[PDB]
């Protein structure tokens with residue numbers, strides 16, 4: 001869905017701006033979802049992320065990295081199944097991959113990482129989200 005691609009572009013633009021990097025991307029039908037995801041991502045990074053293994057140590061993205069290597073690492077998040085906190089961890093992980101790409105003078109990979117996140121989200125997350133209340137459920141549960 002296009003709305004899911006808008007969530008990815010919004011979250012990544014927000015994370016890049018937090019670190020002082022230029023980005024292209026808060027309105028539309030997904031406005032409340034974008035805001036809740038942005039807040040949940042900040043909350044996850046501040047008090048929850050440190051409790052888990054750093055997934056950026058298992059994935060070193062270069063121009064030769066295939067999407068399947070990204071999927072393999074992301075699959076570690078959803079081992080004991082899918083939940084809203086693991087989805088927030090997924091967005092937070094992609095943001096950190098984009099930040100590292102810009103840090104290592106590989107800004108060209110930012111648009112590829114956004115496409116990979118949208119592919120994983122639509123193929124392996126569009127279905128669980130649909131059957132577990134949709135993004136509307138994430139918004140009233142978080143808010």
Ligand SMILES: Cc1c(-c2ccc(N3CCc4cccc(C(=O)Nc5nc6ccccc6s5)c4C3)nc2C(=O)O)cnn1C[C@]12C[C@H]3C[C@H](C[C@H](C3)C1)C2
Pocket residue numbers: 040043044048049052053054055056076077078079083084085086088089090092093094096142
């Ligand atoms: C806190 C959490 C959860 C929750 C979240 C992740 C998770 N796990 C699953 C097993 C696993 C294995 C290996 C690595 C990781 C990982 O995340 N590594 C990462 N590295 C990096 C490096 C850079 C950037 C980002 C990241 S993420 C994880 C994460 N498991 C749970 C779980 O308990 O099932 C559910 N709920 N919540 C709480 C909460 C609280 C508040 C904020 C936010 C959203 C919502 C409202 C739920 C988290």
